């Protein structure tokens, strides 16, 4: 971002984006996501441009560090592949997590016990999580969304282009968001690698934890 | 078929302004529309524009900052004498403080307050406010 060379992409970040499958989008295109695709392959997959992913991710990290209080940035994940990344990001940065089922009224019903009033909203996937995206329209929330190529851009303000479908690329995108916020705010220096692996943010399947528990 | 080209141009401006778009493309291009959009530009309502020259009747690409609530046409062009100008600016305009009626007079195409200051009347073309 910023036309600055300290904030540019390095080859280590690009090897993570290549190895996770962030650049492999979907097979359909919502018509205002086509400023992010490079080209469509013979397979039918659209390729997400990674520089647009990086500049929208750094603009999202600028929007996340711009709140003085870290406790009223709230992160939503309803699908199962982003719950552990939301809980790890919320333990890392000090945000508030909402993982799992999002009971409606938690931004507009004042007398229910889970009534919050955050100042920004980061969601996992803007089609499956459209219930807090619609409930952001009565409370004046700007909304940041990790967006696939086939995902509707109603009521989101900052769309971070990725493959939000797989486990690896969701866990990586929440990891890169945590890393850019903690470097920008001042916690980690820019020159060392961050000591937290992205495998702390990945999804652990019940079949995957049972194959890890029975060792050879 | 297509009659009264200025009307269909101003309906193009209005439909693409109500959606908050930033640039329109007007076709055809009269010399009526270039003086009309000169009048709306000089009051600070649309900003710059371009007259695209093919060797047929050209196109016009207008910049838009939305400042423009309504841009309309009056068809047919009724003869407005100088005593009928207050009856016409009471009908079409939203206020005594703003809004303009463009009318085509023998000193040129001009708005309705300049036609009182130049002491002339003529046929009406439309309005913008």
């Amino acid at each position: 971002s910023g036309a600055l060379d300290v904030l540019q992409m390095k080859e280590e970040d690009v090897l993570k984006f290549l190895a996770a499958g962030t650049h492999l989008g979907g097979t359909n295109l919502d018509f205002q996501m086509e400023q992010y695709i490079y080209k469509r392959k013979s397979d039918g997959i659209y390729i997400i441009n990674l520089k647009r992913t990086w500049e929208k991710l750094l603009l999202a990290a600028r929007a996340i560090v711009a709140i003085e209080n870290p406790a009223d940035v709230s992160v939503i994940s309803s699908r199962n592949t982003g719950q552990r990344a939301v809980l790890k990001f919320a333990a890392a940065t000090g945000a508030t997590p909402i993982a799992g089922r999002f009971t409606p009224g938690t931004f507009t019903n004042q007398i229910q016990a889970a009534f919050r009033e955050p100042r920004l909203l980061v969601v996992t996937d803007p089609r499956a999580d459209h219930q807090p995206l619609t409930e952001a329209s009565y409370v004046n929330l700007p909304t940041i969304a990790l967006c696939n190529t086939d995902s509707p851009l109603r009521y989101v303000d900052i769309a971070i282009p990725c493959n939000n479908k797989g486990a690896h690329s969701v866990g990586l995108m929440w990891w890169m968001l945590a890393r850019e916020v903690l470097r920008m705010r001042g916690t980690i220096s820019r020159e060392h690698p961050w000591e937290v692996m992205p495998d702390l943010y990945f999804y652990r399947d019940p079949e995957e934890i049972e194959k890890e528990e029975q060792a050879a | 078929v297509r009659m009264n080209v200025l009307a269909d141009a101003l309906k193009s401006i209005n439909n693409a302004e109500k959606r908050g778009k930033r640039q329109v493309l007007i076709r055809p291009c009269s010399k009526v529309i270039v003086r009309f959009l000169t009048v709306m530009m000089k009051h600070g309502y649309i900003g710059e524009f371009e007259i695209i020259d093919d060797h047929r009747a050209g196109k016009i690409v207008v910049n838009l900052t939305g400042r423009l609530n309504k841009c309309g046409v009056i068809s047919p062009r009724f003869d407005v004498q100088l005593k009928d100008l207050e009856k016409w600016q009471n009908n079409l305009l939203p206020s005594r403080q703003f809004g303009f009626i463009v009318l085509t007079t023998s000193a040129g195409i001009m708005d309705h307050e300049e036609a009182r200051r130049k002491h002339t009347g003529g046929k009406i073309l439309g309005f913008f406010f």
Binding site: Q32 | G20, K21, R22, Q23, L25, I52, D54, K59, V61
Partner: protein, 82 residues
């Protein structure tokens, strides 16, 4: 969209559109010269020609009228002029 520039269109979206719907309309035909391989008349054909263009050495046909582009006879050689 909705910030979209109409005064500077890209050539991908200027070869995309219909020939009447560009900023300046411009035809999608071109002028060829057909070389017949056993004679030395360079012969000038339209791309979309509607008559059978007869050459004057060995009186052969160069091109066939079809609904679109004229299918040149197979084994001649062509290039676009200009």
């Amino acid at each position: 969209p909705l910030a979209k520039d109409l005064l500077h269109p890209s050539p991908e979206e200027e070869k995309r559109k219909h020939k009447k719907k560009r900023l300046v309309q411009s035809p999608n035909s071109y002028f060829m010269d057909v070389k017949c391989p056993g004679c030395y008349k360079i012969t000038t054909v339209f791309s979309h020609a509607q008559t059978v263009v007869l050459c004057v050495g060995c009186s052969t046909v160069l091109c066939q009228p079809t609904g679109g582009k004229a299918r040149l006879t197979e084994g001649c050689s062509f290039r676009r002029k200009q």
